Design a protein around this nucleic acid. Structure first.
Ligand SMILES: Nc1ccn([C@H]2C[C@H](O)[C@@H](COP(=O)(O)NP(=O)(O)OP(=O)(O)O)O2)c(=O)n1
Ligand SMILES: [Mg+2]
Ligand SMILES: [Mg+2]
Length: 430
DNA sequence: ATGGTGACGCT
DNA sequence: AGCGTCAT
């Protein structure tokens, strides 16, 4: 009791843009607004691959990874925006620039951790303490939480969504202990007030809507965010965890959506995150390792210690292209031309990064996939990145991979290459 | 023949 | 270092 950690020491939010690439394209082109819309990459193979889908389009069953020609079968009036192509490849600059717009606004509120192109974690612990002192033990109005869901409420002793949201918010607020500055539930509530202000700032200053989770750690904040997308935020309290987890599939928790999570289910014979509470820490460590077992033991109790890292910028800048099926690169000259295209994009992004961010990359990593292998990478090699020059980078990449070529003939490349990837890494101050 | 990314753990 | 996992 008096010495058991409850993981209630921090206020952490996760802010995730709604259908992000689509909103970028809808801001640009008003004809796409409030319509079933998707963003596609590469129009020639089956209409292109869908990578982002508006909520109106999702209602028809359109998803990411679908071919646009197939999406049009579900949603005949689906509108499309195409990713830019430059140097023979998809170029994501517009979306990266839009991401910076959002990240810079979030950064005004608190230290952020950029976790993807469209989401960041926020550690609001300090901001909440500051706001609590300014809130001279005075109650928090529901009007300050106009887009907030309280997970698990309403409960106990109106058939529209908004009525339910408000009833739960009222139950929550009515039971808060406003006179104690150290109450975790109060801390979360003030965190939610702050996130409302953050989300309003993003929408006002960019046009983009987002969702958010507010909880005591990253995993709960991320889970919370998705519970009421789009354009809403969700507070997951420590007390909400047992019910929430009791029917929560293991694969829904961040980091458990792959082979580890499948192994938890198989080895333990369980389905839901809450069922993990029945195992000792040692037991979990015995199956999943020291680090994973400790993490699972705490996480299934709503506890996690992974800090919000102070990092707004990506740590690597990379350029890749696949060459599937019959398009696999089978000549030496093809290989060089494409390495050059990638290097050229990389140069342009690196030069802009150095001017914006006062840093320089020092290592170039070259990765290739060989026909027949279904690993992301078949082979990675690194070399020095000493000059932002595309011909140099492309020549150096070729140097470090050219011995992979099994061909006896000079001018051929075998086995043909199904992927090229250049990545700049190991940044230093400049 | 979703593709183009990007962070981080293991040995 | 180079490989693998997980995710958006
Ligand atoms: N596999 C993926 C996942 C995301 N993305 C891109 C396109 C997305 O708009 C953007 C952000 O990813 P996301 O947050 O997983 N999904 P998105 O923001 O589109 O929709 P929401 O479900 O977050 O509302 O990254 C991608 O190109 N390939
Ligand atoms: Mg998103
Ligand atoms: Mg996201």
């Amino acid at each position: 009791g008096p010495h058991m950690a409850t993981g209630q020491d921090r206020v952490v939010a996760l802010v995730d843009m709604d259908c992000f690439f689509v909103q970028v394209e809808q801001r640009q082109n008003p004809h796409l607004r409030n319509k079933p819309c998707a963003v596609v990459q590469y129009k020639s193979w089956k209409g292109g691959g869908i990578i982002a889908v508006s909520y109106e389009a999702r209602a028809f069953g359109v998803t990411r990874s679908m071919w646009a020609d197939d999406a049009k079968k579900l949603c005949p009036d689906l509108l499309l925006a195409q990713v830019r192509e430059s140097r023979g490849k998809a170029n994501l600059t517009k979306y990266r620039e839009a991401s910076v717009e959002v990240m810079e606004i979030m950064s005004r509120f608190a230290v952020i951790e950029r976790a993807s192109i469209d989401e960041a974690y926020v550690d609001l612990t300090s901001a909440v303490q500051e706001r609590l002192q300014k809130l001279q033990g005075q109650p928090i109005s529901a009007d300050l939480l106009p887009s907030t869901y309280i997970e698990g409420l309403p409960q106990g002793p109106t058939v529209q969504k908004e009525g339910m949201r408000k009833q739960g918010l009222f139950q929550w607020l009515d039971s808060l202990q406003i006179d104690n500055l150290t109450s975790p539930d109060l801390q979360l509530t003030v965190g939610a007030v702050i996130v409302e202000e953050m989300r309003a700032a993003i929408e006002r200053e960019t046009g983009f809507q987002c969702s958010a989770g507010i909880s005591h750690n990253k995993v709960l904040a991320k889970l919370a965010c998705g519970l009421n997308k789009p354009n809403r935020q969700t507070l997951v309290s420590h007390g909400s965890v047992p019910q929430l987890f009791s029917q929560m599939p293991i694969r829904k928790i961040r980091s458990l959506g792959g082979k580890l999570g499948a192994s938890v289910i198989e080895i333990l014979g369980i389905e839901y995150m809450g069922e993990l509470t029945q195992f000792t820490e040692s037991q979990l460590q015995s199956h999943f390792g020291e680090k994973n077992g400790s993490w699972l033991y705490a996480m299934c109790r709503g506890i996690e210690h992974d800090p919000v890292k102070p990092r707004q910028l990506p740590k690597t800048i990379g350029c890749s292209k696949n060459f599937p099926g019959k398009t696999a690169l089978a000549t030496r000259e093809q290989v060089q031309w494409w390495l050059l295209q990638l290097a050229q994009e990389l140069e342009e992004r690196l030069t802009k990064d150095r001017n914006d961010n006062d840093r320089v990359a020092t290592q170039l990593v070259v990765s290739i996939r060989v026909q027949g292998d279904k690993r992301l990478s078949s082979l990675r090699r690194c070399c020095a990145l000493t000059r932002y020059d595309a011909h140099k980078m492309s020549h150096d990449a070729f140097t470090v991979i050219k011995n992979c070529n099994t061909s006896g003939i000079q001018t051929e490349w075998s086995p043909p290459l199904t992927m090229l990837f250049l990545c700049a890494t190991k940044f230093s101050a400049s």
